[PDB]
Amino acid sequence: QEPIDFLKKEELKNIDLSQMSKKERYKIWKRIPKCELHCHLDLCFSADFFVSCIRKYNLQPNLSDEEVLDYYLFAKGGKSLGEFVEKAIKVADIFHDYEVIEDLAKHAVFNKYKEGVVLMEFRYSPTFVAFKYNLDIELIHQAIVKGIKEVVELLDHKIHVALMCIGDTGHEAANIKASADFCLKHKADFVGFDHGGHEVDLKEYKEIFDYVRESGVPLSVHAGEDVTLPNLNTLYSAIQVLKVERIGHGIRVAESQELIDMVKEKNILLEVCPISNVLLKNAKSMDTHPIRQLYDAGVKVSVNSDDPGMFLTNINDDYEELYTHLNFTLEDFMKMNEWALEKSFMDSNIKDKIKNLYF
Ligand SMILES: OC[C@H]1O[C@@H](n2cnc3c2N=CNC[C@H]3O)C[C@@H]1O
Ligand SMILES: [Zn+2]
């Protein structure tokens, strides 16, 4: 046996969630064999870990643990994706050296294991990690790959972890072209390519994305998240120009039947991040989060944590929110995790292994 007795499809009907306290519900969420596709490793940490980094490098000697969390992180939320990014830029204070990056990666993988994630596609931005202390992106990648490997080996491969590379916008020394080049140079370690930060129309980088995609690295980019944009052009470009297999967030697809139809017919999956959307004010509330209408419309969706570090949450919190506020069932969650598995960028023989073991 292993620490977590994962739920089987047959057992789901015997579990009455309505009887359970929040504490007892989280024991059930933990036992869901989760496939997570959208989580930023470089912003994936616990409160305790973050504060330890701040103390290690004596960054905020005049602030208490709690003041440090309020100063740097996004647990209470904010106004926008713009405000989220400026706060992420502050968090880059911890990227002091390659030792802390390895430790970050190690703890990130281990916590996902503890939470009951069986398939983990992590993503990180080389330029985002490098800029604050002018680090070497080759050495950053080395530290990350090493940290993941060491923990995965310790855990006897009971969690399967893959990496995506993020080109991004909205921080100093950001470079999409260079990020794409780095991704292809390290194609053996990267299973996909993403764009994050500020949400922009990626039509203007058609050539860079064509080149990455056509080289055999599938695309999943952030689009249809930011509700402050005056139209849905970013989604049309993501789908029709970038030819993405998956969309980060994509919650604004719900505002257009045309996009709903296109996404369904192209077998595109939306990587929904419930808590993230609410905290960035991209959903008005969890009660009115678009995932419910998207799910009912027949669009493929999966549940993701996005940034455990920024929000001081974990993947099981997102499951809790969908159950409590939007009446999602264990059967829904199993279905969505199976979609996530089907749409994952991991090697298919690994995916077949995970399917036989849990689904
Ligand atoms: O991995 C770090 C990079 O990714 C961005 N990033 C991190 N989390 C998100 C990001 N981007 C867009 N929207 C909210 C959420 O999905 C920040 C940085 O550039
Ligand atoms: Zn994201």
Strand order of the largest sheet: 1-2-3-4
Secondary structural class: alpha/beta
Query: Rg from C-alpha positions?
Result: 19 Å
What is the top-level CATH class? Answer: Alpha Beta
Number of separate helices: 17
Shape designation: globular
Percent in helix: 40-55%
SSE topology string: HEHHHHEHHEHEHEHEHEHHEHHHH
Strand-residue proportion: 5-15%
Main sheet specs: 4 strands, parallel
Q: Total strand count, please?
A: 8
CATH structural fold name: TIM Barrel
Q: Per CATH, which architecture?
A: Alpha-Beta Barrel
List each distinct ligand once: 2'-deoxycoformycin, zinc ion
Protein name: Adenosine deaminase
Pathway: Purine metabolism; purine nucleoside salvage
Binding site for a purine D-ribonucleoside: 40-42, 168, 197, 225, 249, 306
GO biological process, one term: hypoxanthine salvage
Explain what this protein looks like in three dimensions.
The longest helix is centred in the first third of the chain and has 18 residues, at 98-115. The strands form two sheets. Strands 1-2-3-4 form a four-stranded parallel sheet, sandwiched between helices. Strands 5-6-7-8 form a four-stranded parallel sheet. It is of the alpha/beta class and 359 residues long. The protein is 47% helix and 14% strand. It is globular and about 55 Å long. The protein has a single domain, classed as TIM Barrel (Alpha-Beta Barrel), CATH 3.20.20.140. Zinc ion (ZN) is lined by residues 38, 40, 196, 222, 248, 306. Residues 40, 42-43, 81, 84-85, 88, 124-125, 128, 166, 168, 171, 196-197, 222, 225, 248, 276, 306-307 line the site of 2'-deoxycoformycin.
